[PDB]
Amino acid sequence: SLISKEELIKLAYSIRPRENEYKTILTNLDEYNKLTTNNNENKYLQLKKLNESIDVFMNKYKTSSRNRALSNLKKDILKEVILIKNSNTSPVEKNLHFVWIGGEVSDIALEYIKQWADINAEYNIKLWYDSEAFLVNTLKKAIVESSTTEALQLLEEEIQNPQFDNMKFYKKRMEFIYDRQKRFINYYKSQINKPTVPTIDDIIKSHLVSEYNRDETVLESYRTNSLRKINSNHGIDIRANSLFTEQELLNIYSQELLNRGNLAAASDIVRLLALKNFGGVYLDVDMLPGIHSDLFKTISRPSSIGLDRWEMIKLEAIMKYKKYINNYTSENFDKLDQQLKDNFKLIIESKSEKSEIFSKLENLNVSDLEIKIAFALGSVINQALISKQGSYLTNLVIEQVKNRYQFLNQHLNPAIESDNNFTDTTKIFHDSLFNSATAENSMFLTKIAPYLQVGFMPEARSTISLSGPGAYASAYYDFINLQENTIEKTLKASDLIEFKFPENNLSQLTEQEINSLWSFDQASAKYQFEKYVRDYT
């Protein structure tokens, strides 16, 4: 709660008459204080209105004796936001949302998912997929593999030279990739309006048969198998539901799914809509249930192994002696002391059910203002989220994503629509983009400039600032500071303890997580390239 209007009057009292902008503050404060309603949103909006009115005063009367008391008010307002979001608080909808789009869901992922279902029988499992787009990953691989071969043939004389700059390969390949995506897309555009009303998979299958020497029967049985496999396993179809309720988000989803072949970005969109509409918990398929706090509370962690690695080996232990998941790595566990390896066996064998090893979600109490998110390396990471349907912050994130894409597309579209190659298209995009640079948005611009090569070239990481963690971190900034449309600033893990995915409720250091956190950096690029050259021979 905030100081009364009367208290502010006393605190900010001065020899001067009350400025008009000061009277407004007093009114906004009083009206906040007199809020009878207990809906979190309406309190928030009034707090926001008060805060804005304070900035108006302070920016106009920069030397006012009142500024100290008003600066103190603004500090109290920051705390009031946290008090509100922590006020009314009840369990999220009992939905676990996963997403596997663009191909056949792996068995490996089904196993990880199975663990959650077993432990939380009262939770509905939603495995989102796109019934029309099972061939999207197949197409992306065809394009990349074809382009790799084209680039290696072109650069055949140079690639073996150990001093070869592998970037020359990646740039060259990107040109071939761009031309092939553009060929696909233009063909898609010619088909999609016919009275036959073809699907994405119809169009991809035909293109693959025509241009990539594929067999229709093989493609078709992969498609029908992917469909039944996913329907049999909590599968829920994006196309038959109410996820996409307006054209703008659909188009963002489609440009990622169809034009770029970026399934991670597509999934970034789907997870947010699933949360907005249904509420619940979202998880990547490499996340696992949290382990009971006191399970290995009696095993001292050696100084030689890190905090993270210790969390990994805990999972590996559970897995060597319960094999809940097939072929779970034992690398880190096999070592080193033969004592703890038995203390591990002792405690794990002393349990008989899975629910004794893993903790249940039960009620996750959140308010209708918030979204909770996992952390990694000091940043938020959207591989795990909790949110009530229609939550204020989840909408803030969606708005961030929409405005970032609106900006991206404003500059990108004219370049795409032009009939140009990769290099010329890039230039038209960059020349428009960087002419919009301000102090405020410069970094963001620099981050989205390599958008077209995301997934295909090293260090192209635009997704983060578009549909990924960067959009969430700016939305968190919006929310904490009662601002809107923040792009320059992000809030970090250390800023957001009040919004953390409760640690006890999640195990992030899983085997599939780690061998998935592969990033397209230089080092990884060097290795991929060396593999490419070794196979080519």
Binding site for Mn ion (CB under 5 A): 286, 513, 516
Distance CA 492, CA 355 (A): 33
Distance CA 381, CA 404 (A): 18
For the CB of residue 514, give the shortest distance to Mn ion in the complex, in Å: 8
Residues in the chain: 537
For the CB of residue 382, give the shortest distance to Mn ion in the complex, in Å: 11
User: For residues 503 and 535, which CB has a smaller minimum distance to Mn ion in the complex?
Assistant: 503
The β-bridge relationship of strands 379-387 and 90-91 is unpaired
User: For residues 268 and 513, which CB has a smaller minimum distance to Mn ion in the complex?
Assistant: 513
User: For residues 250 and 264, which CB has a smaller minimum distance to Mn ion in the complex?
Assistant: 264
Distance CA 116, CA 290 (A): 10
For the CB of residue 116, give the shortest distance to Mn ion in the complex, in Å: 16
User: For residues 22 and 98, which CB has a smaller minimum distance to Mn ion in the complex?
Assistant: 98
Report cis status (omega within 30 of 0) of the bond before 295. Answer: no
For the CB of residue 503, give the shortest distance to Mn ion in the complex, in Å: 17
For the CB of residue 100, give the shortest distance to Mn ion in the complex, in Å: 13
For the CB of residue 429, give the shortest distance to Mn ion in the complex, in Å: 29
CA distances from 8 to 227, 312, 399 (A): 64, 53, 35
Helices (H), 418-521: 422-434, 442-448, 463-466, 469-481, 511-514
For the CB of residue 284, give the shortest distance to Mn ion in the complex, in Å: 6
For the CB of residue 287, give the shortest distance to Mn ion in the complex, in Å: 8
- Tokens 């983009």, residue located: 433
Distance CA 287, CA 114 (A): 11
Question: What one-character DSSP code corresponds to residue 451?
Answer: G
The β-bridge relationship of strands 235-237 and 124-129 is parallel
Q: If residue 213 lies in a helix (H) or strand (E), which one and from where to where?
A: none
Return contacts of 328-334, CB within 8 angstroms, 24+ apart: 328/511, 329/511, 332/305
Report the candidate in 288, 351, 327, 284 with the shortest Cα–Cα distance to residue 118.
Answer: 288
- Tokens 């990033």, residue located: 519
DSSP 146-194: HHHHHHHHHTHHHHTSTT--HHHHHHHHHHHHHHHHHHHHHHHHHHTTS
Which residue's CB atom is positioned nearest to Mn ion?
516
User: For residues 285 and 445, which CB has a smaller minimum distance to Mn ion in the complex?
Assistant: 285
For the CB of residue 517, give the shortest distance to Mn ion in the complex, in Å: 5
Q: If residue 309 lies in a helix (H) or strand (E), which one and from where to where?
A: helix 307-320
User: For residues 17 and 378, which CB has a smaller minimum distance to Mn ion in the complex?
Assistant: 378
**Chain-centre distance for alpha carbon 461:** 13
- Tokens 């067999």, residue located: 215
User: For residues 379 and 391, which CB has a smaller minimum distance to Mn ion in the complex?
Assistant: 379
Torsion over CA: 155, 207, 142, 212 (sign):
negative
Distance CA 148, CA 332 (A): 35
Q: Would you tell me the crossing angle of helices 136-154 and 522-536 to the nearest 10 degrees?
A: 70
Strands (E), 360-457: 365-366, 372-376, 379-387
User: For residues 64 and 115, which CB has a smaller minimum distance to Mn ion in the complex?
Assistant: 115
For the CB of residue 309, give the shortest distance to Mn ion in the complex, in Å: 17
For the CB of residue 264, give the shortest distance to Mn ion in the complex, in Å: 10
User: For residues 87 and 516, which CB has a smaller minimum distance to Mn ion in the complex?
Assistant: 516
Could you tell me if 293 and 357 are in contact, meaning their C-beta atoms sit under 8 angstroms apart?
Answer: no
User: For residues 316 and 513, which CB has a smaller minimum distance to Mn ion in the complex?
Assistant: 513
User: For residues 174 and 266, which CB has a smaller minimum distance to Mn ion in the complex?
Assistant: 266
List the beta bridge partners of residue 382.
none
User: For residues 128 and 529, which CB has a smaller minimum distance to Mn ion in the complex?
Assistant: 128
For the CB of residue 518, give the shortest distance to Mn ion in the complex, in Å: 9
